[PDB]
Fold this protein.
Amino acid sequence: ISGVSPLLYFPPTTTSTTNREDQINKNTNIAIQMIKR
Amino acid sequence: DIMVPSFVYNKLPVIHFLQEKRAEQKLRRVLDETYTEWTEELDQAHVTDAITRSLNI
């Protein structure tokens, strides 16, 4: 990469508090809005 | 008693045949108006892509 990076990279799991009933639900309401429109 | 009955009797066959043909015509028209409707619905791929945009990925 023709240079020494300023910083390292880590798996970006900082916001790990992501629920499964929440993620599906958010996708659900995106769909219903589109289905109706 | 004699004349009108004889002429009605003579009429019967042609009328019967024409009415049979008319009924067959009605059935044929009923059949010809049947078409299978195919509806197009929004592809879910776009919905998934929009979901990604909301995810800010």
The CA atoms of residues 11 and 17 of chain A lie 15 Å apart.
